[PDB]
Design a protein around this ligand. Structure first.
Ligand SMILES: OC[C@H]1O[C@H](O[C@H]2[C@H](O)[C@@H](O)[C@@H](O)O[C@@H]2CO)[C@H](O)[C@@H](O)[C@@H]1O
Length: 457
């Protein structure tokens, strides 16, 4: 458990943490409270793993789209800023952090991906995606490359996939339809087909991650990169003469990046709740506070009206806003992470040719919509027919495909042993045993010691 009398904050390592550290350093010699800022790898997934065990940081910075999930697991306190404080920020940023009626975080900044290009290597930037393959074949000559960006994270490839009709969840009569998923329609299919083709013809390498693309652009090896306002800082230091511009169109349609609002949540387990509120409202979300972070790594447009009034003239902020305009603010519904993971997997499996586009994307449809396997359905039909009173274990299938049907609590359940002729599973004459516990959980212990064939296999 986190201790009382300090503040532990987590932010992504691509953001201006050292800028945030100074705000906490100003906070420290003002109230007398130690603020230590960290930036763990895989933060957005690490937070729920530590939190639910009452162990996270006090405050957490991530784009708003993950917050609905956190809120549903009960990891976030609901924030209580007065009407005076709410007026200091843009209404739409508040919408982004509003979940099931309640405000669940403080909005900080509006992020959108932009096309970044090298002016010395590329006077005029391409307007269409279709002309980049033609462009890279010219840059073959001078040992340079047209375009590299993070192909590991579907945030970067989504703008292309969304362009021609692909979407996450259908919005419908003031709500998202979590079963209606635009991940393998004609539009999404086209977009990825096009991406996959850039790698086949060797215009990009499927193993290109964030820091590979970053290093390539900033040293002058590549002509373009796709990135957000945080990236700018290092590019300045590099002294590369760069432009920030509207993302290329695909099939005459604009790229549609998913816009994120950087946001700060309060750990529901954290005792230091008022102290956390004290920090964000009075120290971070201020001209000074936000300026300090922005200097370190640019935030984009900021949620605080007053300080946004300052940054507005920056042509690069304009470009961010032009792209954000073409795209959309992400939903914050708890299914967003199932969506992201689906697309993350689709893109990588296709990127490496483990799957075709259509296989990769039909899988993504499955994944994103939280749909039931055939195996799931088969197993659930095993008890539906006969009725039990009281606590029950839900049907589930274990990692060797044994179906443990819905069963009464506190009972031993007997199922046929698995065996496999090559890929073909079948059931033997022997049995495996598993207890359904008094509390409706399946026991971790599964006795397979009589399963003669599988032991031999
Ligand atoms: O790649 C999917 C990923 O995209 C977004 O994460 C962004 C984040 O919002 C940006 O601020 C920046 O740090 O880059 C991240 C991409 O690595 C979503 O916010 C996130 O939920 C999603 O998984």
């Amino acid at each position: 458990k986190i201790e009382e009398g300090k503040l532990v904050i987590w932010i992504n390592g691509d953001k201006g943490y050292n800028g945030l550290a100074e705000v906490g350093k100003k906070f420290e010699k003002d109230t007398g409270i130690k603020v230590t800022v960290e930036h763990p790898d895989k933060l957005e997934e690490k937070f729920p793993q530590v939190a639910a065990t009452g162990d996270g940081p006090d405050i957490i910075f991530w784009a708003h789209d993950r917050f609905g999930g956190y809120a549903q697991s009960g990891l976030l306190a609901e924030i209580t800023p007065d009407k005076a404080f709410q007026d200091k920020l843009y209404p739409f940023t508040w919408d982004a952090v509003r979940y099931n009626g309640k405000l669940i975080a403080y909005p900080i900044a509006v992020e959108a991906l932009s096309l970044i290009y090298n002016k010395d290597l590329l006077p005029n930037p391409p307007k269409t995606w279709e002309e980049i393959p033609a462009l890279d074949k010219e840059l073959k000559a001078k040992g340079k490359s047209a375009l590299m960006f993070n192909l590991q994270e579907p945030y970067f490839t989504w703008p292309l996939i969304a362009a021609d009709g692909g979407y996450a969840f259908k919005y419908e009569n003031g709500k998202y339809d979590i079963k209606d998923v635009g991940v393998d329609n004609a539009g999404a299919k086209a977009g990825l087909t096009f991406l996959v083709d850039l790698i086949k013809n060797k215009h990009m390498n499927a193993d290109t991650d964030y820091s590979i693309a970053e290093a390539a652009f900033n040293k002058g090896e590549t002509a373009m990169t796709i990135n957000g306002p945080w990236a700018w800082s290092n590019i300045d230091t590099s002294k590369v003469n760069y432009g920030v511009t509207v993302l290329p169109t695909f099939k005459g349609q604009p790229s549609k990046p998913f816009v994120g609002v950087l946001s700060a949540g309060i750990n529901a387990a954290s005792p230091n709740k008022e102290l956390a509120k004290e920090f964000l409202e009075n120290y971070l979300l201020t001209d000074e506070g936000l300026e300090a972070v922005n200097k370190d790594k640019p935030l984009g447009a900021v949620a605080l009206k007053s300080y946004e009034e300052e940054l507005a003239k920056d042509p690069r902020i304009a470009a961010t806003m032009e792209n954000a305009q073409k795209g959309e603010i992400m939903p914050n519904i708890p299914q967003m992470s199932a969506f992201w993971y689906a697309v993350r997997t689709a893109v990588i499996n296709a990127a490496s040719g483990r799957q075709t586009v259509d296989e990769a994307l039909k899988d993504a449809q499955t994944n994103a919509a939280a749909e039931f396997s055939l195996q799931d359905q088969h197993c659930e039909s095993l008890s539906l027919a006969s009725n039990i009173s009281g606590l029950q274990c839900n049907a589930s299938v274990d990692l060797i495909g044994t179906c443990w049907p819905r069963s009464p609590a506190g009972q031993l359940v007997v199922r046929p042993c698995p065996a496999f002729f090559y890929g073909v599973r079948y059931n033997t004459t022997n049995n495996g045993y598993r207890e359904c516990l008094a509390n409706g959980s399946w026991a971790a212990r599964v006795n397979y010691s009589e399963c003669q064939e599988i032991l031999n296999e």
